[PDB]
Design an enzyme around this catalytic site. Structure first.
Site, PDB file in Angstrom:
ATOM      1  CG  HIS A  83      -1.180   1.444  11.371  1.00  0.00           C
ATOM      2  ND1 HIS A  83      -1.018   0.079   9.949  1.00  0.00           N
ATOM      3  CD2 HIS A  83      -1.783   0.509  11.783  1.00  0.00           C
ATOM      4  CE1 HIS A  83      -2.117  -0.741  10.055  1.00  0.00           C
ATOM      5  NE2 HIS A  83      -3.000  -0.509  10.917  1.00  0.00           N
ATOM      6  CD  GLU A 118      10.837  14.377  -7.723  1.00  0.00           C
ATOM      7  OE1 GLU A 118      11.876  14.771  -7.186  1.00  0.00           O
ATOM      8  OE2 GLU A 118      10.619  15.982  -7.139  1.00  0.00           O
ATOM      9  CD  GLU A 162      -2.079  -3.477  16.059  1.00  0.00           C
ATOM     10  OE1 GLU A 162      -0.319  -4.011  16.500  1.00  0.00           O
ATOM     11  OE2 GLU A 162      -2.841  -4.527  15.845  1.00  0.00           O
ATOM     12  CG  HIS A 167      -6.176   0.095   7.051  1.00  0.00           C
ATOM     13  ND1 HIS A 167      -5.581  -0.697   7.512  1.00  0.00           N
ATOM     14  CD2 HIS A 167      -6.831   1.428   7.780  1.00  0.00           C
ATOM     15  CE1 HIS A 167      -6.216  -0.939   8.867  1.00  0.00           C
ATOM     16  NE2 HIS A 167      -7.409   0.290   9.116  1.00  0.00           N
ATOM     17  CG  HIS A 180      -3.974  -5.342   9.005  1.00  0.00           C
ATOM     18  ND1 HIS A 180      -4.097  -3.752   8.976  1.00  0.00           N
ATOM     19  CD2 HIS A 180      -4.325  -5.529  10.080  1.00  0.00           C
ATOM     20  CE1 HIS A 180      -4.928  -3.903  10.673  1.00  0.00           C
ATOM     21  NE2 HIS A 180      -4.952  -4.815  10.865  1.00  0.00           N
TER      22      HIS A 180
HETATM   23 ZN   LIG Z   1      -4.088  -2.611  10.413  1.00  0.00          ZN
HETATM   24 ZN   LIG Z   2       7.884  18.107 -10.542  1.00  0.00          ZN
END
Ligand SMILES: [Zn+2]
Ligand SMILES: [Zn+2]
Ligand SMILES: O=C(O)[C@H]1O[C@@H]2O[C@H]3[C@H](O)[C@@H](O)[C@@H](O[C@H]4[C@H](O)[C@@H](O)[C@@H](O[C@H]5[C@H](O)[C@@H](O)[C@@H](O[C@H]6[C@H](O)[C@@H](O)[C@@H](O[C@H]7[C@H](O)[C@@H](O)[C@@H](O[C@H]8[C@H](O)[C@@H](O)[C@@H](O[C@H]1[C@H](O)[C@H]2O)O[C@@H]8CO)O[C@@H]7CO)O[C@@H]6C(=O)O)O[C@@H]5CO)O[C@@H]4CO)O[C@@H]3CO
Ligand SMILES: *[C@H]1CC(=O)N(c2ccc(NNc3ccccc3)cc2)C1=O
Ligand SMILES: [Zn+2]
Lengths: 274, 274, 274, 274
Positions: free
Chosen positions: C141, C171, C117, C143, C212
């Site tokens: 990247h 947050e 990639e 999963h 993915h």
């Molecule tokens: Zn992937």
């Molecule tokens: Zn807090």
């Protein structure tokens, strides 16, 4: 001589942050930790003290905490990094004799500042000394995963929320017989939310914030961690049970009265009336 | 001479408790462990024995455990710190000649006492020796998470729960064909709960305390840990399928009847009827 | 002299892989991670540099990355094995002054090749420079478990997905105020997916690949870790809340604008107005 | 509605002063008494409260005593007259929410002010809460007739003074195991004498001022009176024996150990060393 990082309190602070990181309540930089000390504890370590104690004013006067030293957690730091650099993540401060500022005597290196929740941490310290006669010394805040998910389905009131937690397990009633207090939604980081939290600290040792997290206090770190640890475990059962189809059988109202009499605890009147 | 901290039974205790805090079972002070030893085991370690054994009377006479030493975990202690300091958290006791009390020989420093569930230990320890001709040597108690949530949704029956626990995995039937005992909700720390728990041990090797936890008994530490964990795995398997909408296929009774006699095991007849 | 493996960037990336390893995000060899370096950061460590640097041409010209050194992982290399062998799992490359090829300087031994990639990482590395004026230095990247399951249930539209994540934790609106962009499903490893992934990086710091994984960028190695960690925790809470039966009360639109007003962050108008 | 003069605390304050008048320790206006109450005690008596509570500033802040009511004796009042006109000799005060002053709600008519030794009473009230965990509530001062005589002839030291009164009677050991405190002669009514008195109250519950009088503390009025009453009677036999020529056979140091161990009371270290 051993450096200050070998003191009994500094080693204790590493244990709390390290274990909370494995539990999963302090993603990114969430959570804070403060501890109360005594002037005799830090006496032998005067060499480590910085030559320029930085002075920071207080938001509002706190006369009760005059001449009181604390060890805090710096703002914008990662709980996982505390075990790797105690000097750059922790530090010690001492409240002045008037109650309007403190001096940074060590730590918080490279213009680091204490946690932004200090107004909430200091206001709750004052209201707990009066309600415990100088016994509680530790304040902890964490984003308990199982407690946050509860505020989206349960009614945001002090009575029903406290009652639900009592039925999660037997030991829950004994540990916190006064229940927990839950506020309405408010923007964090403001003094308007610190006052509301300090107001609820007068009656309870556990405070809940909808959609945000939890607040707790205790005598020492081991007892403070156990209070939060016990509370979250009860929430874990409820979420697991609720997704199964809801509660079917539970502890009756009279049964908790028998449990309370054995251990010499007084349950909250509002919650037990439900 | 090798220290007492390196002995096989001490190293057994450090392994068993640490493996329970990592599985999320023993929050705060929940949990205790008593293991039966022989006089030969403690013979080489006479040097570290205390010179002034404090005498504490037992609640009820226990003639069947006379002259039998035990290793116990202290009351109000934290399972996380046992590895950090075994001496301050673990202890050794010995029953006197007439079976009226016990003496403290090593450990339990600073006025520490054995676990508050000690009467529930000796009442069940004596009975398990009779049933299995003295093979049993370990008693285990811990707060397993998924196990407790089952009691909130399933009928609190010995036969019904054991039937479901058999269908969760193929190994469960062989491991505990005797089933698991169930009791009504009662107040802990009393001799009344000791009688009921020990009474059910005559026919089952495991007992379930509703909303509280589980009680274990086996020949050694290694099997005792795996005795309950087998039911924990069946609960985790059960919990996931319950939230899916129910269980659609499983091991049938006609499949189960042939399984035991393959191993030459006698199944619990009460659960076989259902 | 001190080995390059004992420098700050080699040790730093060892942490990032191992931390994500235990989370359950990067089983087998999935996921990728690169970090941008400086010439001065690697100047004194020419001893470990390969005598003959292998040359590999780029698929498409990248003028903005000319004469810039990077550190990357190897293709077919598990994130677990890195701490066992820093040299055989990482590598440092330097794109030529034209932007068409690169030379392997250190690491990546035994005919090792960077991840498949790499076009997607280099394309996003260049385009984030325009948006952040060189502040962002890391592309990651992996999963994420709970983010993958969300795309099966929630519609793949920016307005809906962004609002739901903003409501699972307070947050979140502060961590990623720009929202999360969603791509259509594409065949991985091609060049078509690289152009669409970079296209969403112009207006989002979080890009989701349906079924993915997820993409994210951060200024340093730790900030990018917290960004994914914060977003993962929010999705974990939403999973339990949605699975528990539904969601009853929420943070209103009036509260959302007030929260962003205090911290000086502008919410996405399209998703906010929903 | 029952009048406030018939309350359970006003009728108890008459008894303490009347009983001491018949003993002879309060000639003219010597001695004063203060008692701590709870907000529920004075709630039903709201009707009779003055409509213009006079405000009296405090010399120094007392944050620990905020929102706390008391009942005191007037300044320049005769202990013999309290039974005749309760409203003119007694009053009710209440510290404000900050701790810099108090109000007057009832009593002290015709412009009467609390006793001039209030700072000494207030400072000892605050300290004894910490060393006792909120049980001691009463402070009493009186001029013992014989205890002044012992000061003119005995060495003004803490060690020998404590041990001599310990030899007067058997019950002396049990009542005050912590002994008594002796201060250098200072002018009464000063803030310096108030601070010095509070320092010695951290250790013992009996304080001696040379040639002047004595101080005491206890949970209730009856328990506080018996502490000084026991001390005075023990000192009575001392001078009676002393004036006959001196001691001839007294209590040995060994017997003090046996008696204290019997009742589970730990004696003072320095005093027992002598
Ligand atoms: Zn992937
Ligand atoms: Zn807090
Ligand atoms: O009765 C008392 O509470 C007091 O009540 C009245 O006071 C009110 C004010 O008139 C009113 O404006 C308002 O006050 C606010 C003020 O305007 C704000 O600016 C702010 O105050 C902060 C202040 O600016 C800041 O410097 C600091 O204050 C510290 C101060 O500098 C420092 O010197 C010390 O103060 C001591 C003081 O010097 C002493 O003389 C004594 O004070 C006496 C005072 O002399 C008396 O007259 C009496 O005060 C009345 C006042 O007269 C009324 O008008 O009683 C005081 C206490 O005995 O002791 C002081 C303490 O040692 O410390 C100050 C501080 O404690 O650190 O911090 C201030 C707070 O942030 O906020 C105030 C409050 O909102 O409200 C007042 C209350 O109604
Ligand atoms: C609680 C305890 C106390 O003393 N407080 C207080 C209030 C006001 C105040 N004002 N100080 C001041 C005003 C104007 C000019 C100089 C000083 C000081 C302290 C509390 O709030
Ligand atoms: Zn238990």
């Amino acid at each position: 001589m051993q450096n200050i990082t070998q003191s009994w309190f500094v080693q204790g602070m590493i244990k709390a942050t390290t274990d909370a990181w494995l539990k999963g309540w302090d993603e990114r930089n969430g959570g804070n930790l403060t501890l109360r000390l005594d002037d005799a504890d830090i006496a032998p370590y005067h060499d480590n003290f910085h030559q320029q104690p930085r002075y920071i004013p207080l938001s509002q006067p706190m006369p009760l905490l005059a001449n009181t030293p604390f060890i805090v957690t710096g703002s914008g730091k990662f709980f996982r990094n505390v075990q790797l650099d105690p000097a750059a993540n922790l530090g010690i401060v001492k409240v002045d004799s008037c109650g309007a500022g403190y001096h940074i005597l060590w730590g918080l290196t490279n213009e680091a500042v204490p946690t932004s929740e200090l107004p909430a941490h200091f206001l709750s310290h004052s209201e707990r000394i009066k309600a415990t006669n100088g016994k509680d010394r530790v304040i902890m805040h964490c984003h308990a995963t199982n407690l946050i998910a509860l505020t989206y389905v349960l009614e945001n009131d002090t009575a029903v929320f406290t009652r639900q937690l009592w039925e999660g397990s037997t030991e829950c009633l004994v540990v916190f017989p006064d229940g927990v207090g839950i506020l309405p939604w408010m923007v964090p980081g403001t003094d308007a939310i610190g006052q509301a939290t300090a107001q609820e600290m007068q009656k309870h040792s556990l405070v809940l914030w909808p959609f945000h997290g939890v607040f707790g206090s205790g005598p020492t770190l081991d007892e403070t961690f156990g209070l939060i640890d016990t509370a979250e475990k009860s929430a874990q059962v409820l979420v697991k049970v609720y997704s199964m189809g809801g509660m079917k059988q539970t502890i009756s109202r009279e049964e908790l009265i028998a449990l309370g009499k054995r251990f010499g605890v007084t349950p909250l009147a509002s919650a037990l009336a439900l």
